[PDB]
Each structure stands twice: as C-alpha cells, then as structure tokens.
Design a protein around this ligand. Structure first.
Ligand SMILES: CCCCCCCC/C=C\CCCCCCCC(=O)OC[C@H](COP(=O)(O)OCC[N+](C)(C)C)OC(=O)CCCCCCC/C=C\CCCCCCCC
Ligand SMILES: CCCCCCCC/C=C\CCCCCCCC(=O)OC[C@H](COP(=O)(O)OCC[N+](C)(C)C)OC(=O)CCCCCCC/C=C\CCCCCCCC
Ligand SMILES: CCCCCCCC/C=C\CCCCCCCC(=O)OC[C@H](COP(=O)(O)OCC[N+](C)(C)C)OC(=O)CCCCCCC/C=C\CCCCCCCC
Ligand SMILES: CCCCCCCC/C=C\CCCCCCCC(=O)OC[C@H](COP(=O)(O)OCC[N+](C)(C)C)OC(=O)CCCCCCC/C=C\CCCCCCCC
Ligand SMILES: CCCCCCCC/C=C\CCCCCCCC(=O)OC[C@H](COP(=O)(O)OCC[N+](C)(C)C)OC(=O)CCCCCCC/C=C\CCCCCCCC
Ligand SMILES: CCCCCCCC/C=C\CCCCCCCC(=O)OC[C@H](COP(=O)(O)OCC[N+](C)(C)C)OC(=O)CCCCCCC/C=C\CCCCCCCC
Ligand SMILES: CCCCCCCC/C=C\CCCCCCCC(=O)OC[C@H](COP(=O)(O)OCC[N+](C)(C)C)OC(=O)CCCCCCC/C=C\CCCCCCCC
Ligand SMILES: CCCCCCCC/C=C\CCCCCCCC(=O)OC[C@H](COP(=O)(O)OCC[N+](C)(C)C)OC(=O)CCCCCCC/C=C\CCCCCCCC
Ligand SMILES: CC(C)CCC[C@@H](C)[C@H]1CC[C@H]2[C@@H]3CC=C4C[C@@H](OC(=O)CCC(=O)O)CC[C@]4(C)[C@H]3CC[C@]12C
Ligand SMILES: CC(C)CCC[C@@H](C)[C@H]1CC[C@H]2[C@@H]3CC=C4C[C@@H](OC(=O)CCC(=O)O)CC[C@]4(C)[C@H]3CC[C@]12C
Ligand SMILES: CC(C)CCC[C@@H](C)[C@H]1CC[C@H]2[C@@H]3CC=C4C[C@@H](OC(=O)CCC(=O)O)CC[C@]4(C)[C@H]3CC[C@]12C
Ligand SMILES: CC(C)CCC[C@@H](C)[C@H]1CC[C@H]2[C@@H]3CC=C4C[C@@H](OC(=O)CCC(=O)O)CC[C@]4(C)[C@H]3CC[C@]12C
Ligand SMILES: Cc1cccc([C@H]2CC[C@@H](N3CCN(c4cccnc4)CC3)CC2)c1
Ligand SMILES: Cc1cccc([C@H]2CC[C@@H](N3CCN(c4cccnc4)CC3)CC2)c1
Ligand SMILES: [Ca+2]
Lengths: 607, 607
C-alpha cells in the first residue's frame, strides 16, 4: 500500500534480474554481452534478424555492447545497423539513455570516437528515474553526455564532446547546469580540475550571467550551491575568482573579497541565510572560511551584540514587571466555610473578581497592562513568520509565553476560577526564555546548546525506561500500602500519589518512607531495597554518566555550534531591524572605482 | 581426584622429560638426536642392535631423526631399516604419528621426498590426544599428512603429497576435512592462499557436494564454519564464489549474492542462527559484512519491526489490564480487633475470600481472567523452548512473571492469606519486561544492554564489598543503640531493621539519624562520621565513577551489540511466525533462469 516504500527498490531488483534473463534467452544480446564476434557476424546476416529488439530495460544490442564495454562487438552492430546508434532506452527506470551515454560513463572508450563518427546525439537527455538525485540512486550525473563525462573525470572525453557540439549550458530537470553537478559529486578534489576546464570552454560573447552566475530551479548559483551542500573544497576554489590582492608587503598581503553573494544584498537569499536554513551538518564549516568568519565577527562585534544586549535588557526588564504583577495579584480571603473533605483542604483565599478599588491595584493595573501589550507585540512579530515561511526551540517557548499571558487575561476579564494555572506556565516559560539571550556571551553560550542536546538526547531515551521502573514499583508500592493506615507513612495513599512519590524516590528528592514506631509490611523492605539499587544506585547514576560521556565527544561540535548561533542571530537581527539602523557590511566601491559592489579587505601574515 | 584437571598437564610435563631421559640412556636414539653419522654407522652394524626399540612416547630412531630434522642421520636409519618407515608412535599422547607426519610439520624437509620414496603411508591418522582440538593443545593440525602440510603453509609439500595419492577428502574424528582445518588456524592470511590450492586439486567428476559443501560431524560446511569461528578474513574470501557482478556502470557495480547458506532455507540451521547461538565475541563481526548486514536490515525494516511493535503494543496493553486488576483487588475492612502487639500494627483490610457479588467485581473478573489466559500462553510458547532446546535475561523474567500470575491465581481460589507477595513480584517482573521491547528502537536500544552489563558487572563486584561495610556498621550501630530508648531515633531497634537502615544510609536514601533534643551516645557520632566518609563519600562515588569509566571503553562494544539484538529478534520472529506471514528474503530465481536459489542484489559506488 503506502507503507511499502521498499516496493520500488524491490521493483528494480527484480527488473535487473529480468534484464539478465532477456539477454540469455535471445541470441544476439548474449552475443553482444560477450564478444563472440565470429558468432555475431552470423546472427546479423539473416533475413529477419531483429537488431531492433529490446531487453527488459529497453536495451538494444548496442546498449549491451556498450554496457559491457565490448569495443569489437559494438563496431559490428553499427556497421550492419547504423540506425541503431540513434535509439535510446525506453524503460521508465532508464529513459532516453542513448548508447553514447553508456560509453561515456565507463570513464574510457574508443567507442565514443566511433559513436560520434556515426553522428550520435550529444543533446540526449537521460530523463529516467535512475538518474534523478535521490537517496536511492548512488549516482547523480545529470542528463547530458558531457554531464556524464565531467562527473567521471575524463578530460579527454569532455573535450571531445564539446568539439562535436555539446552545449555548455544544458540544464537538467532540476535546473542544474554542468557546473552545478560537479559540486555535489563525492570526489571533491577531481571536481576542482573539472570546474576550471568547463569554464575554459565558455568564452561566450553573449555573456549574460556568463556560466557560473546562471542559477538552477531554486535560485542557487554554483557558488551558493557549494555553500548549501557543504562543499568546503569547492568553496575555497570558487572564492579564488572573488578575492584579489591589493598589495603584498614582505610576509604581509592584503586581499579584497568581493562579498556580493555572501552578504544580504536585497530581497534575495544571501549565502549566510542558506547555511543556517539548511539541514546539513557539514554546511556549517563554511562559517570558518576566510571571507565568512571575518564577515560574521565584524557585524556581530559592531552591530549584532549592541542590538542583542538591548533586546536582552528590555526583555529581562519586561519580565520583572510581569513577575511583580503576579506576586501582587488580587486575592481575598475565603467565604465558603470549607465544607469540603475537611482536613484535606487548606486553600483559603479564592481570588477577587472585579475588586480594583485600591491605589495599589491601579499601579498593578499599569504593570499588568504592560505585560498584555508586551505579549501582543510578541504575537505580531512571530506569528507573521510561522504562517509566512511555510510551517517549518525559543520560537515555541515565546509564542507559548505570549499565549499564556492572553489566557490569563481572558480569565481575568470573565472572572474565571483557576488562574494560577496559566500564570504558573507563564512565569516559567517566561523566565526560561532569558536563556535565549545567553548566546551573545561566549562563556554561557554553548551551555545552552548542551541543555537542548540532553533534554532531547540523553534524557529522552532515559525517560522511556525510567517510566517503566516508576510504573512497576509505584504499582508495587501502592498495593503494599493499600491494606494499611495512610495516617502514618501516607506516601502511597492513592494511585496518582504513589506515582509521584515513586518519581520523587527515584531522584532522591524526598526522604524515603520510614515510620520506626509502627511495623511496616515485610514486603516493603524487600521491594524498596530493590528499588534503591536498580533505580537510585544503578539507573540514576547511569544517566549522570551518559551525560558526562556525552560532553568530551561532543566538546568540539558543541563549541563550534556557538558561532552558528551567532550567524542565525545576526541574520535575524538584520532582517527585522530597518535599514536606517544596521549599516551594511564592508566598504562600497562606488567612490573607489571598483563598481557597485561591497568589498571586505583583510590583511594577514603568510610567513 | 576430580578437582585436579591439571593432573594431565602434569602428566605430560613429566612425560616429555621422560622422553629426553630415554634418548640419553640409549646409544642410537642419542645418535639420531644429534647427527653423529660416523657413530651411527657403527651402532647399526651389530648382531642384535635394536633399531625397533621405543622411547617414552614410543619413538623409533627415525622419529627422533625426523623430529630434530637430521637429514643425514635419517637416511642411515632407512637404509639399514626400510621397515622403520611404516612404524607409528604408540603412546596415548601421540598415537599413530608416523615419521612422515613429523617431517611435514617442520614446514620443510628433503626427507619427505625420501620417506615417500620408501612408500610411506599418506593415509596415516595421528589420532593421539595431543592432536585433538582443545584449550590445552596449542595446535590443531588434523590427523593426516596433507592436513599437517596445509596448516604450516607449505605449498611445495602439499602438491608433493597429493601427487603420491593423498586423499583430498580425508576427515578427522571431528569430521573436519582439510578445508575445515584451514579456517580455524591462527594465521588467516596464509590460509586464503591454501584454501584456493586445495580446491584446485579437487576436479572431482563424482562431484556430490564437491569439496566445500561437505560438512563435519556437527553439520557445518567450510562456509558456515567461518561464520561460527569468527573468521572474518576467510568469510570474505569464501563469499567470492557466491557473488557475481551483473553489470558495472562506470563507478557503479551490481553484484548478486547467492544467499543460500545465510538465510533460513528450511529446518536446517542457517548462518544467522549460528552466529547468535555461539559463544564467541569475534563471530558477531560477520553481521557487518556486505551480504549479511544488508540482509538483516532488509528483513528488519520490512517485516521485523512491524511484527515487533505489534507484540510490544499487545504486551504493554496486556499489562495495563493486569495492573488494573491488582489496583482494584477485593479488599474488605478488618474484623479481628487488632489484639496484636498494639501500636506496632496498622494493617486494617485483610482481603476478601469468595465475595464477588458486585457489578464492579464482574468487570474485574473479565479483566483478571485475561491475565490468567495471557500468562498460560506465555508458558506454552516458552516452556516448549527450554525443555526442547537442551537446558541452555528476558526469557527468565517472563517465565517468572507467568509463574507469579499462576501463583496468585491459586491463592485466589483457595483463599490463601498473603496475596500481596506474588502480585508485588508480578507487577515489577511484569513492567520491567517492557524493557525487552526497547530494542526495536536504536535510541533506547543499547541503553538496555548497559543495564545488563552493570547489574552483572560493576554492581555485582560492588555488592560483595558493600555488604561487608553494611554488616560491619549495621552491627556497630545496633549495639550502640541497644542500651537506648527506641521511642526516639529508632532507626536501629532490632537487628533486621539496623541492616535496612544502614543499607538506606549507605545510599543516602533516608535522612540520617539525629534527635537534637536528647543526647545520643558518644560512640555514635564517631562511627557515623566514619560511615559517612568510607561508605557515602568514598565508596558510593567510587561506584558511580566505575560506571562512568565503564561507558567510554565499552562505547563501541555496547553500540555494535544493538544490531546483534536485531538479528536475535529477527531470527526469533521468523521461527515463531508461520510461513503465511513473513515472506522470504531476496528474489527467487526460478523465473529468471538462476535456479532454485534466493538471491539478494546490491549496488554500490566503488570510486
Ligand atoms: C528580533 C527583533 C525583534 C523586534 C524588534 C522591533 C520590531 C521591528 C522594528 C519596529 C517596526 C516599526 C519600524 O519601522 O521602526 C521604525 C523606527 C524608526 O523611526 P523612529 O523615529 O522610531 O527612530 C528614530 C531613531 N533614530 C533616528 C536613531 C533612527 O525604528 C525604531 O526606532 C524601532 C526599533 C527600536 C528598538 C531598537 C533595538 C533596541
Ligand atoms: C531599557 C534597556 C536599554 C539598555 C540598557 C543597558 C543594558 C545593555 C545595553 C547596551 C550595552 C551592551 C554593549 O554595548 O556591550 C555588550 C556588553 C559586552 O561588551 P564588551 O564589548 O566589552 O564584551 C567583551 C568583548 N570581548 C569578549 C571581545 C572582550 O554586554 C554586556 O555585558 C551587557 C549585558 C546586559 C544584557 C543582559 C541580557 C540577559 C542575559 C541573561 C543570561 C541568561
Ligand atoms: C521594558 C519596559 C517594561 C517595564 C517598564 C515599567 C512600566 C511601569 C511600571 C510598572 C511597575 C508595575 C509593578 C507591579 C507591582 C505593583 C506593586 C504594588 O502594587 O504595591 C507596591 C508595594 C506595596 O507594598 P505592600 O503591598 O506590601 O504594602 C505595604 C503596607 N504598608 C504601606 C503599611 C507598609 O511596594 C513594595 O512592596 C516594594 C516592591 C519591591 C520590589 C521592587 C524592586 C524591583 C525588583 C527588581 C528590580 C531589578 C532591576 C533589574 C535587575
Ligand atoms: C513519556 C513517558 C511517560 C509516560 C507516562 C508515565 C506516567 C503515567 C501517567 C500518569 C498521569 C496521571 C493523571 C492524573 C489524574 C488521572 C488519575 C489516574 O491516573 O487514574 C486513576 C485510576 C484510579 O486510581 P485510584 O487510586 O483513585 O482508585 C483506587 C480504587 N480503590 C480505592 C478501589 C482501590 O488509576 C489508574 O490510573 C489505573 C490505570 C493504571 C495503569 C496506568 C498506566 C499508564 C499508561 C501508560 C504507560 C505508558 C508507559 C510506556 C513505557
Ligand atoms: C515471538 C512470537 C510470540 C508468539 C506469537 C504467536 C504464536 C505463533 C502464531 C500462532 C500459532 C497458531 C498459528 O499457526 O497461527 C495461524 C494464523 C493464520 O491463520 P489466521 O486465520 O488466524 O490469520 C489470517 C490472517 N491473514 C490472512 C492475514 C494471514 O496466524 C495468525 O494469524 C496468528 C498470529 C497473529 C499475530 C501476528 C503479530 C501481531
Ligand atoms: C492492539 C495493538 C495493535 C497495533 C497497534 C499500533 C501500534 C504499533 C503497530 C504498527 C506500527 C509500527 C510501524 O509500522 O512502524 C514502526 C514505528 C516506527 O516507524 P518508522 O519506519 O517511521 O521508524 C523510523 C525509521 N527510521 C529510523 C529509519 C527513520 O515504531 C513506532 O513508533 C511504534 C511504537 C509502538 C510500540 C510500543 C512498544 C513499547 C516500547 C517500550 C519501550 C520501553
Ligand atoms: C491485548 C488485549 C488485552 C486487554 C484487552 C481488554 C480486555 C477487556 C477489558 C478489560 C478491562 C479490565 C480492567 C479491570 C479494572 C476494572 C475497573 C472497575 O472495576 O471499576 C471501574 C472504575 C469505577 O470507579 P470507582 O471504583 O472508583 O467507583 C466510582 C464511584 N462512583 C461511581 C460513585 C463515582 O472506573 C474508573 O475508576 C475509571 C478507570 C480509570 C483508568 C482507565 C483508563 C486506562 C488507563 C490507561 C490507558 C492507556 C492506553 C495505553 C497508553
Ligand atoms: C549477596 C551479598 C549480600 C549478602 C547478605 C547481606 C545481608 C544479610 C542478610 C540479611 C537477611 C535478613 C533476613 C530477615 C529475617 C531474618 C531475621 C534475622 O536476620 O535474624 C535475626 C537475629 C536476631 O535478631 P533480633 O534483633 O531480633 O534479636 C536481638 C536479641 N536481643 C533482643 C536479646 C538483643 O539476628 C541475626 O541475624 C544474628 C546473625 C548476625 C550475623 C548475620 C550475618 C549475615 C550472614 C552472612 C553475611 C554474608 C556477607 C558476605 C560478604
Ligand atoms: C510594552 C513594552 C514593554 C513592549 C515590550 C515587548 C518586548 C519586551 C518584546 C516584544 C517583542 C519581543 C521579541 C520578539 C522576538 C524575539 C526573537 C526570539 O528569538 C527567536 O525567535 C528564537 C530563535 C531560536 O532560538 O530558534 C527571542 C526573543 C525576541 C528577541 C523578543 C524579545 C522581547 C520583545 C522585544
Ligand atoms: C522523565 C519524565 C518526563 C517521565 C516521567 C514523568 C512522571 C514521573 C510524572 C510527570 C507528571 C507527573 C504527574 C503530574 C500530576 C499528577 C497529579 C497529582 O494530583 C494531585 O496533586 C492531586 C491534588 C488535587 O487535585 O487537589 C498527583 C501526581 C501526578 C499523578 C504526577 C505523577 C508523576 C508524573 C506522571
Ligand atoms: C547490593 C545488594 C544486592 C546487597 C545488599 C542487600 C541488603 C543490603 C538488603 C537486601 C534485602 C534486604 C532485607 C529485606 C528484608 C528484610 C526484612 C525486614 O523486616 C521487616 O520489614 C519486618 C516487618 C514485618 O515482618 O512485619 C527488615 C529489613 C530486611 C532484613 C532487609 C535488610 C537489608 C537487605 C538484606
Ligand atoms: C488473552 C490475550 C490478551 C493474550 C495475551 C498474551 C500476550 C500478551 C503474550 C502471550 C505470549 C507472549 C510472548 C511470548 C514470547 C515472547 C518472547 C520474549 O522474548 C524472549 O524470549 C527474550 C529474549 C532475550 O532477551 O533473551 C519477549 C516477550 C514475547 C514477545 C511475549 C509477548 C507477549 C505475548 C504475545
Ligand atoms: C534491562 C535488564 C536486564 C536484565 C535484568 C534486569 C533486572 C530488571 C528487574 C530486576 N528485578 C526487579 C525487581 N525485583 C524484586 C522486586 C520485588 C521484590 N524483590 C525483588 C528484583 C530484580 C531483575 C533483573 C534488567
Ligand atoms: C580496603 C581498605 C584498605 C585499607 C584501609 C581501609 C579502611 C577500612 C576501615 C577503616 N576504618 C573503618 C571504621 N573506623 C572507625 C569505626 C568506628 C569508630 N571510629 C573509627 C574508621 C576506619 C580504616 C581503613 C580499607
Ligand atoms: Ca532528607
């Protein structure tokens, strides 16, 4: 049905086996799979021999000879069938893959001289589903023959395809040209030799975003695609045509970076925004490169940190006047005589409803109307981001804060009863948002990362085995003290409280049930000595030793993930703040003869 | 008696020394141990010189000359005694070891030309107890001369034995042929050169399980024996005759694995069952090999995980209706006036006996008859495995659960008194079996391994030194507060409770005895300050630091032991479930011209 996404991997495994069956049960496809050239001359000099018959993938006999790189057998199929060269595969898995595609992928042939001598099409599009990029195809070579030749590092075949008229600007279904595909190849060193070779054959008089400024179907150039895909090797090589040394002075050079596709120019997505909003771990190592790590720590020292410690001082002072309008909330004494289950009730205030007739209730009225306005402004700069940027932690904890302030407003107006419940969330979803502003400080910055990596990490996998233990012993502790007097040692008197006592006894944050005047059940002393060992001794200290084994093997990741929080903050502070504040980064080159671009120089010793 | 298993190692140490005594006190055995050929001609040209006399191991003089590789002295014993070649050793330690065996083991001789020129037997069986495989013999070479020659890596001697008629199919007492013995040799690289050489001399027209399909006396072929013995090097080499590349496409090949001795064909034990049910740590590295790690994670993603989260949702829902039939158990109030030792008794319910006359006792009756049926079905699919597979943790914890449910059933029928005791075990042996189903999840999967490795690990060796301390201080705390008023600070009022208070004070899961109104004994403040240091401070934190030193040096073992739990689960889910469910793994080759075997292809980049 829908649960089988492995029913297409199953459908192509039994399609490759059916390919090898059709080769064996047909005489010339087996004669092309082997050489068998003395037997291959005989099979084609017949009356109605089918040279145009297909296999399971739609192979002709020239496809089989080019796939098993039989040079001598493939010459015979082109002599006695010159029309066979122009014929592609027709199966849905391999659509349009001509015989020129197959002889190119094998990184060699003397057949690509012979196929192009028979005027084979260099603009054939291998549009089949085995050539799309996916996490189920081991290759993404493109669609075109020079896209296949440039990804196998064949500099003799790429030059020989272009001399026969291969279009240098051919794009895929994804929009990727030849120069995009080289970036997302697994062999990053050999793609740098090929990136230079494919640009040498541009020389295109109609320049018009010449060859490495043309984007794919999601608006990424080759330079920005190396940023998203995490290609560090093709990022330093792509940066070489953007820097230029002003002067060298002994050991001291002074380059000048172009910075026109890294910094936020206009409404276009800059390369600092693509690295943050991508889902790769290796993409955030471009934040350590020499035009980027000196661009981020130049608009964070100057402009990013003063505009982040002003928003961290307004918010920390906004929430002291939210705390004090919950400490001083209106609260009368009780009227209903406590005719409740007596001695199991001690609530004695039951807050006011329309009583504000006090000059201390008017000072609070100003101070609790600031926190209403301050929680509407959160829902006017955060909700127009969630429902304007698709659907995809401190975002969630500040809509939730701003929702709980509006819930306790509606409960204040309609005089609803339980108002301690939205305030208790808003006093702790609110104060724990001051941990957001512990990323402008390098000391207490990564300490907020390794709280996220442990809540949704080491403590989320400990959660599901702790709850196994504290449901087994809490249900064992309950039925032991069920035939009991709860007046003394009443830790487990009803089944919710036995769960919460046993959770507390797991963490040793209450004492441990003992009376010493009255004989406890005999079964209690055994099942609590078992709960003491396998839960307090064993399993609690197993969790503080898998948080101390977490650190030293995430100590590099957690410390390089601080300046990825600086980029995400500097990008956010730049988009929200207007252009009257926040001057642009770098030195504009209108008054220096360098164009309309914004440059960033840096000097360094090179020894 | 029986306690001396080192009385046979003692019996062969004094048997090798007695061998060296008999050589010295006899003239020609010392003349054969050295060369002494001018003295060796003289000793044999006598009237009644004993050339057929024995040593302590039953050596003839040709054995001594072949053991100390004296080529020139051994020629003289064969000229003047050609009958001496055919004579084996007769001691129980070295039975049947002819002189051809000894000249072969030394990895060289020109004597093996000379012994075979005297038509020495190539089918001599060295059946002595120093040649059986054991953890007290450093060698297991086999029984036959070409079994001795192939295990010393002598390709000149193996070819020269076969040309004189050495049987290629000779088997041991263990059933091992020549090709089995090469697998369980300590030098794994040189056995791959020999495995190919011994198959080249097969060419056997009577094929009939040709040479590497013949099993030993426990049903293992050479391919399955490399799985059990942990031979990773002879597993990849043995797999080369099972894969075959369908096609190579540039960097992209497509092999097709045979999978007929790895997957469960029928009632025969497949190789995935042999790796799990063996006692070697190095055998479970064959689970990471390219036809096996892609077979396991193909019938776990498809069929193993849906049939394991259905059994983990039935069991977790079976035991919520066992918990609720213990929360709501029938329980009257007390009748016997508490004429017990008054104020030391608070049990006040003493559960019902035949009172079910309630419409809430009938809903429980359905819910506690499900847990009776659900605990019989456990004892019908687990007891027919224990008493049907020899005699050899979550097996034990679910027979014990299913036994405690049947004990609390018998106590319910006969109206037995103490029923809180089988329920208290069954509520915690039952809930802690939900940790079994935390192996279908890779996050909380290895977290169940390092609970087993710490209960029967770091906490089992801490158990025997903690109980030394909490018997010494509990017996010191008892006699201090023995001359005391137990009405106030009654932690230690009788000797069982002093043990349980001191166990709790060890773990700091009760407070710590203090009264502050009445003067405690002076001796208490000294012996509790000693118990605070050497038990709470020193020895408790010694145990949480040897669980945190456990992790980072078992972090690789504990994480590769997760997918050994997946294999053991996938094997168990395949044996229990019928063939109507659970389709077989791989693609059958009846409709593709490949035979009756079940193949598994995989494609990969090879750069
Ligand atoms: C993450 C960001 C969270 C939200 C931040 C505020 C929301 C975005 C800004 C407000 C939107 C309305 C707007 O477009 O804002 C226009 C005003 C500029 O006009 P003005 O006369 O108020 O400032 C004159 C002061 N001068 C001369 C020095 C420029 O910008 C302002 O000041 C408003 C910003 C003042 C706060 C700065 C940081 C503390
Ligand atoms: C109404 C409020 C309006 C503004 C009130 C003044 C508050 C601060 C605003 C302006 C000052 C910020 C500033 O201009 O400088 C930022 C300073 C650090 O300045 P620095 O360059 O010397 O850093 C050291 C540089 N290094 C590392 C290279 C040596 O930051 C600081 O201390 C300021 C810290 C105040 C912000 C509190 C945020 C709450 C954090 C909670 C953590 C949990
Ligand atoms: C971003 C901009 C947003 C915020 C801008 C401000 C907006 C305008 C101002 C809002 C303030 C609203 C606060 C709501 C609380 C109302 C207080 C109230 O309604 O009554 C004041 C209480 C009365 O005392 P009482 O009721 O006990 O009667 C005593 C009985 N008799 C007189 C017999 C002795 O006065 C007291 O208690 C003294 C209070 C003690 C705590 C005050 C100190 C503040 C705490 C921390 C500051 C730290 C700064 C950052 C670091
Ligand atoms: C994220 C990982 C953690 C997952 C949650 C772990 C904690 C479980 C959730 C607890 C929330 C409690 C909600 C509080 C209010 C509802 C009360 C309640 O809870 O109902 C109470 C009932 C009745 O109690 P009673 O003493 O008043 O009547 C005694 C009758 N007389 C006196 C005749 C003996 O008792 C009963 O719940 C009977 C049912 C007992 C079995 C409940 C099992 C919990 C469900 C799923 C566990 C999942 C674990 C996965 C691993
Ligand atoms: C570890 C394994 C622990 C024990 C597992 C169950 C014991 C072994 C199976 C029961 C033995 C009796 C038997 O031989 O079982 C025969 C039935 C097949 O006949 P059927 O008409 O009941 O199923 C028709 C449904 N159809 C058409 C979709 C196949 O297999 C079944 O369904 C019974 C199995 C149903 C549970 C599947 C996993 C949840
Ligand atoms: C009467 C009950 C009959 C069945 C009721 C429905 C419950 C589940 C049965 C069918 C759903 C199982 C399924 O079809 O899928 C298994 C899912 C995960 O599916 P996935 O492929 O997306 O995994 C992610 C794949 N990856 C890692 C490559 C990205 O497992 C899950 O969450 C399901 C978890 C439910 C089982 C609870 C077992 C108790 C565990 C206690 C731990 C202590
Ligand atoms: C694989 C298949 C195996 C199992 C399949 C099901 C088999 C058929 C069903 C079996 C159910 C057995 C349950 C035995 C317990 C009987 C309960 C009982 O006999 O009485 C029901 C109680 C009565 O209340 P009361 O005695 O306090 O009198 C109140 C006094 N008046 C009325 C004055 C207010 O009703 C209550 O308390 C409400 C109960 C609260 C807890 C129920 C919710 C369940 C808990 C967790 C579910 C989570 C799912 C997994 C995640
Ligand atoms: C796996 C590692 C842990 C090994 C076990 C560690 C804990 C030991 C086992 C404890 C189980 C206790 C069983 C509870 C019921 C039996 C009661 C009992 O236990 O008998 C109580 C007797 C009498 O007590 P009373 O206060 O009523 O009379 C006082 C007389 N008046 C008043 C005249 C002064 O007291 C006596 O046991 C006198 C005997 C004292 C010496 C017992 C030594 C324990 C045996 C072996 C230790 C192995 C350590 C290996 C390292
Ligand atoms: C009536 C007066 C006092 C107005 C008071 C309002 C301010 C105290 C509020 C309104 C909008 C708030 C801002 C709304 C948006 C954000 C971004 C938010 O960051 C995120 O979205 C989280 C990023 C992540 O960690 O993933 C952190 C708080 C902050 C700066 C808020 C800081 C506090 C602000 C300025
Ligand atoms: C690692 C964590 C996420 C997993 C384990 C969580 C549980 C151990 C905790 C979380 C919330 C706790 C519950 C929160 C609410 C209640 C209700 C509470 O009831 C009352 O306080 C009644 C008083 C009244 O209503 O007046 C009793 C404890 C109990 C069941 C708690 C029992 C223990 C719980 C389930
Ligand atoms: C690491 C562990 C495995 C080694 C140490 C275990 C002991 C410290 C524990 C395990 C079981 C405990 C015992 C379990 C049962 C009892 C009976 C108990 O007696 C009662 O509760 C009497 C009440 C009644 O019978 O009504 C007193 C504590 C005692 C001796 C406990 C003392 C401490 C013991 C020996
Ligand atoms: C009346 C109705 C509700 C029937 C309910 C019965 C089921 C809830 C029980 C009966 C048989 C049980 C199974 C019996 C065998 C096993 C294998 C057992 O695994 C082992 O043997 C442990 C392996 C190891 O860790 O060494 C784990 C539980 C499981 C799946 C059990 C899961 C729960 C089952 C299906
Ligand atoms: C993940 C794992 C693997 C293997 C073994 C475990 C332990 C989990 C339960 C544990 N019992 C739990 C409770 N018992 C108990 C209960 C009441 C009275 N007296 C004794 C003692 C031991 C025994 C084994 C866990
Ligand atoms: C494994 C090991 C090696 C070497 C030494 C030890 C310590 C174990 C007992 C320890 N005493 C135990 C109790 N004493 C004591 C007791 C009562 C009142 N006042 C004092 C103090 C010290 C002293 C040495 C352990
Ligand atoms: Ca305490």
């Amino acid at each position: 049905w829908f649960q089988r996404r492995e029913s297409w991997a199953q459908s192509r495994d039994e399609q490759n086996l059916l390919q090898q069956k059709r080769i064996w049960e047909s005489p010339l496809l087996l004669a092309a799979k082997d050489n068998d050239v003395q037997a291959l001359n005989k099979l084609l000099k017949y009356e109605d021999c089918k040279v145009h018959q297909r296999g399971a993938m739609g192979e002709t006999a020239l496809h089989i000879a080019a796939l098993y790189d039989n040079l001598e057998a493939a010459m015979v199929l082109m002599e006695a069938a010159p029309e066979l060269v122009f014929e592609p595969m027709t199966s849905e898995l391999y659509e349009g893959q001509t015989a020129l595609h197959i002889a190119v992928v094998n990184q060699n042939m003397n057949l690509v001289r012979a196929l192009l001598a028979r005027r084979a099409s260099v603009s054939a599009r291998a549009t089949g589903t085995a050539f799309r990029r996916s996490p189920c195809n081991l290759i993404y070579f493109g669609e075109h023959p020079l896209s296949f030749a440039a990804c196998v590092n064949s500099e003799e075949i790429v030059r020989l395809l272009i001399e026969h008229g291969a279009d240098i600007r051919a794009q895929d279904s994804l929009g990727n040209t030849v120069l995009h595909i080289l970036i997302l190849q697994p062999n990053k060193t050999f793609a740098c030799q090929m990136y230079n070779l494919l640009l040498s054959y541009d020389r295109h008089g109609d320049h018009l975003q010449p060859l490495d400024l043309v984007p794919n179907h999601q608006g990424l150039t080759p330079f920005k695609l190396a940023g998203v895909e995490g290609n560090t090797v093709m990022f330093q090589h792509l940066m070489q045509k953007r820097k230029h040394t002003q002067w060298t002075y002994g050991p001291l050079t002074s380059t000048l970076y172009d910075l026109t596709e890294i910094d936020s120019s206009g409404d276009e997505q800059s390369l600092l925004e693509l690295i943050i909003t991508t889902k790769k771990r290796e993409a955030r190592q471009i934040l350590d490169q020499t035009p980027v790590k000196e661009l981020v720590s130049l608009k964070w020292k100057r402009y990013g940190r003063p505009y982040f410690c002003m928003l961290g001082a307004i918010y920390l002072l906004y929430i002291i006047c939210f705390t004090m309008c919950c400490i001083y909330r209106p609260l009368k004494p009780r009227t209903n005589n406590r005719t409740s289950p007596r001695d199991n009730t001690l609530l004695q205030q039951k807050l006011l409803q329309e009583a504000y007739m006090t000059p201390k209730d008017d000072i609070r009225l100003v101070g609790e109307l600031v926190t209403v306005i301050g929680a509407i402004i959160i829902l006017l700069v955060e909700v127009p981001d969630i429902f304007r940027m698709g659907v995809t932690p401190f975002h969630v904890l500040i809509i939730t804060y701003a929702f709980m302030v509006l819930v306790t407003m509606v409960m204040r107006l309609i005089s609803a009863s339980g108002e301690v419940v939205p305030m208790s969330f808003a006093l702790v979803l609110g104060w724990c948002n001051v941990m957001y502003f512990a990323r402008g400080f390098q000391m207490l910055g990564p300490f907020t990362i390794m709280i996220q990596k442990m809540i949704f990490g080491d403590l989320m996998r400990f959660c599901w085995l702790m709850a196994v233990v504290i449901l087994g012993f809490a249900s064992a502790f309950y039925i032991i003290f069920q035939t009991e007097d709860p007046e003394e040692l009443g830790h487990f008197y009803d089944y919710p409280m036995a769960l919460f006592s046993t959770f507390e006894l797991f963490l040793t944050i209450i004492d441990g049930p003992a009376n010493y005047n009255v004989d406890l059940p005999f079964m209690y002393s055994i099942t609590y000595a078992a709960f003491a060992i396998i839960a307090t001794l064993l399993m609690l200290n197993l969790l503080i030793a898998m948080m101390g084994d977490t650190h030293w093997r995430v100590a590099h990741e957690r410390d390089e993930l601080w300046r990825a929080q600086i980029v995400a903050t500097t990008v956010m502070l730049e988009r929200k703040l207007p252009r009257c504040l926040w001057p642009r980064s770098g030195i504009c080159g209108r008054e220096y003869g360098l164009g309309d671009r914004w440059f960033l120089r840096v000097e360094d010793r090179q020894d």
